[PDB]
Structure 1
Amino acid sequence: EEPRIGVYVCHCGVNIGGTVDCPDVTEFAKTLKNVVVARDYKYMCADPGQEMIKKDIKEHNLNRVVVAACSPRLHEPTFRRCVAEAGLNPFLFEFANIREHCSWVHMHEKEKATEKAKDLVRMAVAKARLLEPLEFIKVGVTQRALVIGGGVAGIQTALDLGDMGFETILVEKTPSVGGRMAQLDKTFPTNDCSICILAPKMVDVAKHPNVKLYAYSEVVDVQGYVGNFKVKIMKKARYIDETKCTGCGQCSEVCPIDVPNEFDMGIGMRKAIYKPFPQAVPAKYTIDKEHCIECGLCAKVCGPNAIDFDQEPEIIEAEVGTIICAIGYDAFDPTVREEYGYGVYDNVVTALELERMINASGPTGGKVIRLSDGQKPKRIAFIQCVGSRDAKVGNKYCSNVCCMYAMKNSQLIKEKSPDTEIDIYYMDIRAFSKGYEEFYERSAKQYGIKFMRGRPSQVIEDPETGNLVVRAEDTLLGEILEKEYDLVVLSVGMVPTKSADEVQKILGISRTPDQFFMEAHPKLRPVDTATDGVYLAGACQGPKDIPASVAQGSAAASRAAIPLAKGEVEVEPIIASVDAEICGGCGVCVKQCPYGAPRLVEKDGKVVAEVISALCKGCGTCPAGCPSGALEQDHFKTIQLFKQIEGMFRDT
């Protein structure tokens, strides 16, 4: 049968129509071979727009549909479901991107944008003619979830999925769950003890009947697709018998190697054999082989003889249906902003280091003290937006929680020592959520915390006393201030965690300009990724506070529970297949596939290649490399792409 194409040009209100002359593109589409219906509408994805396509498919007997509008990455599934409801196979639908790829980037070149939209429509129509009906492949869903990261976001996802009755696996990189929330003393805007409220959730997730906790473990490999993921978890060796470990801590006293305690942000010193924090879950000790000298002094003191250097990491193979990435964030390193002197001046600290100094279980015993002489500071300055809203460090985003934690920690210091003078150097006070503006009012009115509108130019240390001078313009007075302080606290921003690169490659997910993980859509899908079966939750998706991370943890559980609850999902049949009559078994395709899908086999007395359909992810590398043309990727066949290329210059 000959193609009967329906072309739809969206205006997207004025997003497309305001730059591209949609009525003119619609008239041009009609001049193309096989195009029998062409219409322009304000919103093609809206009810009237979708009903218009369906009605035309039936009335004009269309076997191809072209929608010139937004990106397929946003509404391709939406229009595929729309055409399928009218009886048209979803793979006979073609998208032409004239918004993100045209109207939004050629706003001052309307005529050339209109001509580009015509060519993009002709290219879409050209490929559409040779598109073929493909059967959406129905695949089963393994009734099991995987959560990567055991912070407040990850713990919430696992608890929600576990409570729903779904088997869940929670992998935590460090020896304990809890994340950065465990490092905080209190939490704004209620000033609740962070661990005193998080600990119950850590306890709950550790003994949940539907949650398998793998602490001090890392996901080293993920293979497959939605509902059929095959994951490899490396249970790292603590070199201490897990079951015989009491958690008393007497073998550390003899260890001669001092390692900076990561949990205390480098202020504290721990041994090669240790426990992250006193309320850690699971409560067990670990040996760090990156700094261990293997002298065996700890083993002599240890009664249980739990210490075993011959311990080997275990690779656990698990099958899951959905994966939730909740690996969190890291604090920005302010060494780069040299004018502030971090790493040079002893009394210049970050806010996360202050959290630890303020924390009762911290290295200073909950006492805020100068690192140069151990004395309590009488005057403190907070410097906002350090590593945020700054093009010089490549971080042009708002870290979201720094205004609030600076005001919170200032209240905690005033509670401990009311005589302390505290000044906050800011640009904008961002107290945007429930009880936040009130917290800001309270900080000034009740605690006497002072606010200076002006981003400091530099910090100068007095080498004789260790005191610091903050140079900044009080923009509200139009005068330069040069106030002296005993301690300067840099309100550092949030950056993706160090392991984010490793996790990105394993899950096959993208990043946003801020370097955090990319959600499928900022409003249509805040916790989904463009990779089916992979979701996000917490700070790893972008800078945010606890309730936002907790809500995202719950949102991810719901979204990841949909495929599990359904028990069946549909996958794109854009896979490679070999034409046995043309393949002479050259073997070029075999090594090109990273999944090992194409394999040489015997057929009709001779050798030929054959693709294991289930192992093909549909990249199109082996068909591109096939020298005989026997290998072809459905939906991206060479002939289809060839006509698309012709479509840019002429009607084919």
Structure 2
Amino acid sequence: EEPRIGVYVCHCGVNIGGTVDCPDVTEFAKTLKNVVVARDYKYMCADPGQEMIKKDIKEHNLNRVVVAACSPRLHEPTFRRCVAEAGLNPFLFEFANIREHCSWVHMHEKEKATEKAKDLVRMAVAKARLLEPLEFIKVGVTQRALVIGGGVAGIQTALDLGDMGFETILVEKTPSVGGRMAQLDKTFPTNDCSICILAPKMVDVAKHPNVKLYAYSEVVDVQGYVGNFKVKIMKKARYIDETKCTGCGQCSEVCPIDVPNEFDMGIGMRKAIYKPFPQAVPAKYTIDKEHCIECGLCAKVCGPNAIDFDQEPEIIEAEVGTIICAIGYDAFDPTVREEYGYGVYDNVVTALELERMINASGPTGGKVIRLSDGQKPKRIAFIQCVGSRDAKVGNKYCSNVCCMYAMKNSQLIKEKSPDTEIDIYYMDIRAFSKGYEEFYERSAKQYGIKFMRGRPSQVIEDPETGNLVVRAEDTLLGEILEKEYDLVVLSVGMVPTKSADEVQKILGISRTPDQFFMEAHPKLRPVDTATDGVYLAGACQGPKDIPASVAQGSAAASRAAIPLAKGEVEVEPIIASVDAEICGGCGVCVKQCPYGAPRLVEKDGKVVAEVISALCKGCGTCPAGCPSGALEQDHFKTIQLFKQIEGMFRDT
């Protein structure tokens, strides 16, 4: 049959129509070959727009639909379901992006943006003519979930999934689950003991019948697609027998290597054999082989002889149907802002070091003391927006929690020492959620905490005393302040965690300008990714507090449970296939695929290539490299792209 195309140009209210002359684009679209219907409407995705398309598909017997509107990364599934409801195969639909790619980037050149939209419509119509009916591929969904990261956000997702009756694997890289919440002393705005409320969750997840917890483990390989993932988990060697070891810790004394205790942000030293923190789950000790000198003194003191250096990492192969990434975040390193003196002055600390100093289980026994002389500081200055809202360090975002945690620990210091003077140097106080503004008022009226509106310009150490002078304009007075402090705390912001690069490559997910992981859309799908069957939860998706991470944890559990409950999803048939009559068995294509889908086989008494449809993801590399042209990926054939290139310059 000859193509009968319907072209629909959206205004997106004014987001498109304000820049692109949408009526003039629809008029141009009618002059194109095979276009029988062309309309422009304010919202194509709204109910009147979808009913319009479907009514045209039936009344005009359309076999192709072109929508010139937003990105297909937003609404391609939406319109594929729309046209499929009217009978039209979902892959006779072509998307033209005239918003993100045109109207929003050419606002000052309306005439050229309109001409450009016409070209983009024509390139779409060109490819549309050669599109073919494809069948969505139904695949079974493995009734198991994987959660990477055992913080409050990942714990919440596993408990929710486990409580629904889904088998769930929880992989935690460090020896213990708990995340940074396990490092906090208290939590604003209620000042609940952080570990005391979280520990019952850590207990629950270790004891849960439907949750397998792999602590001191990391995901090292992910293969397959939604509902059909095959993952490798490396259970790293503690070099201690989980079964034969107490957790008493009488081998550290017999260790000559002192190692930066990362749980305490390096303020206190830990031994080569260690337990991260007392409330750790699982409560089993570990040996850091990186700093281990293998002198064996611990093994002589060890009674059970649980110590075995021969211990090897064990790889777990497991099939899951959905994956939730919840690997958290790290604290910004404020060394780059040299005028503040971190790493140079003894008495400049980050706020997350402060959390460990204030915490009773912390290295200092909960006592805030200067790192130069060990005395208690009587004057303390907080500096806000350190590493955030700062183009000089590349972090132009707001870290969301630093305003609240700076007032929090100012309250906790006042409670342990009422006569401490505390000044907070801020730009905006962002106390934006339920009880936050009240917490902000409380900090000033009840705890007498001072607020200076003025980002400090530099910190100057008195080399005699070790004290610090903070210099800032009191912008609410128009005068330059130069107050002296005994301790300066840098309210450092949040950055992605160190391993976010490794995880990103394994899962195949993107990143937003803030370097955190990219949701499919901030409002349509706040915890989905554009990778089907992969979801986000918590601070790894962006800076946020505990209730926000927990909500995302539960949200990601709901979203990840949909394919598991359905038991069956559909994947795109944009796969490569070999034409046996043209393939001469050259061998070029088999090494090109990273999943080994193309293979050399003998057919009809001769050698041809053949691709296992199940191993092909649809990248299209091997068809592009095929010398004979026997390889082709559907929906992206060379002839279809050829017509699209012609469509820019001329109709066909």
Partner of 2:271: 271
TM-superposed CA distance for 1:357, in Å, is: 0.2
Q: 1-side partners of 2:341 and 2:406: how far apart?
A: 19
What's the secondary structure of 1:95's corresponding residue? strand
Instruction: Report Cα offsets for 1:183-240 as digits up to 9, x if no partner.
Output: 0000000000000000000000000000000000000000000000000000000001
What's the secondary structure of 2:262's corresponding residue? coil
Q: 1-side partners of 2:550 and 2:81: how far apart?
A: 32
Instruction: Report Cα offsets for 1:316-346 as digits up to 9, x if no partner.
Output: 0000000000000000000000000000000
Q: 2-side partners of 1:642 and 1:419: how far apart?
A: 76
Instruction: Report Cα offsets for 1:561-597 as digits up to 9, x if no partner.
Output: 0000000000000000000000000000000000000
Instruction: Report Cα offsets for 1:335-373 as digits up to 9, x if no partner.
Output: 000000000000000000000000000000000000000
Q: 1-side partners of 2:121 and 2:279: how far apart?
A: 62
Partner of 1:213: 213
What's the secondary structure of 1:592's corresponding residue? coil
Instruction: Report Cα offsets for 1:288-341 as digits up to 9, x if no partner.
Output: 011000000000000000000000000000000000000000000000000000
TM-superposed CA distance for 1:534, in Å, is: 0.1
TM-superposed CA distance for 1:617, in Å, is: 0.1
Q: 1-side partners of 2:30 and 2:284: how far apart?
A: 72
TM-superposed CA distance for 1:254, in Å, is: 1.1
Instruction: Report Cα offsets for 1:131-151 as digits up to 9, x if no partner.
Output: 000000000000000000000
Instruction: Report Cα offsets for 1:148-174 as digits up to 9, x if no partner.
Output: 000000000000000000000000000
TM-superposed CA distance for 1:458, in Å, is: 0.0
Partner of 1:38: 38
What's the secondary structure of 2:645's corresponding residue? helix
TM-superposed CA distance for 1:478, in Å, is: 0.1
Moved over 3 A (4+): none
Partner of 2:392: 392
TM-superposed CA distance for 1:19, in Å, is: 0.1
Partner of 2:174: 174
Instruction: Report Cα offsets for 1:256-292 as digits up to 9, x if no partner.
Output: 0000100000101001100000000000000101100
Matched, 1:53 2:56: no
Q: 1-side partners of 2:566 and 2:268: how far apart?
A: 49
Instruction: Report Cα offsets for 1:616-644 as digits up to 9, x if no partner.
Output: 00000000000000000000000000000
Instruction: Report Cα offsets for 1:447-495 as digits up to 9, x if no partner.
Output: 0000000000000000000000000000000000000000000000000
What's the secondary structure of 1:18's corresponding residue? coil
Q: 1-side partners of 2:236 and 2:587: how far apart?
A: 39
How many pairs were matched up?
A: 652
Q: 1-side partners of 2:345 and 2:378: how far apart?
A: 18
Partner of 2:308: 308
TM-superposed CA distance for 1:601, in Å, is: 0.2
Q: 1-side partners of 2:245 and 2:651: how far apart?
A: 75
Matched, 1:358 2:365: no
Q: 1-side partners of 2:406 and 2:202: how far apart?
A: 27
Q: 1-side partners of 2:612 and 2:60: how far apart?
A: 39
What's the secondary structure of 1:524's corresponding residue? coil
Q: 2-side partners of 1:119 and 1:442: how far apart?
A: 60
Partner of 1:500: 500
Q: 2-side partners of 1:547 and 1:586: how far apart?
A: 58
What's the secondary structure of 2:224's corresponding residue? strand
Instruction: Report Cα offsets for 1:397-429 as digits up to 9, x if no partner.
Output: 000000000000000000000000000000000
Q: 2-side partners of 1:277 and 1:287: how far apart?
A: 14
What's the secondary structure of 2:170's corresponding residue? strand
Instruction: Report Cα offsets for 1:92-148 as digits up to 9, x if no partner.
Output: 000000000000000000000000000000000000000000000000000000000
Q: 1-side partners of 2:18 and 2:167: how far apart?
A: 51
What's the secondary structure of 2:456's corresponding residue? coil
Q: Which runs of 5+ in 2 are unaligned?
A: none
TM-superposed CA distance for 1:56, in Å, is: 0.2
Q: 1-side partners of 2:485 and 2:432: how far apart?
A: 29
What's the secondary structure of 1:649's corresponding residue? coil
Q: 1-side partners of 2:317 and 2:82: how far apart?
A: 39
Q: 1-side partners of 2:340 and 2:428: how far apart?
A: 20
What's the secondary structure of 1:9's corresponding residue? strand
Q: 1-side partners of 2:378 and 2:626: how far apart?
A: 74
TM-superposed CA distance for 1:245, in Å, is: 1.2
TM-score by length of 1: 1.00
Q: Which runs of 5+ in 1 are unaligned?
A: none
TM-score by length of 2: 1.00
Identity level (%): 100
What's the secondary structure of 1:96's corresponding residue? strand
What's the secondary structure of 1:627's corresponding residue? coil
TM-superposed CA distance for 1:48, in Å, is: 0.2
What's the secondary structure of 2:306's corresponding residue? coil
Q: 1-side partners of 2:159 and 2:551: how far apart?
A: 13
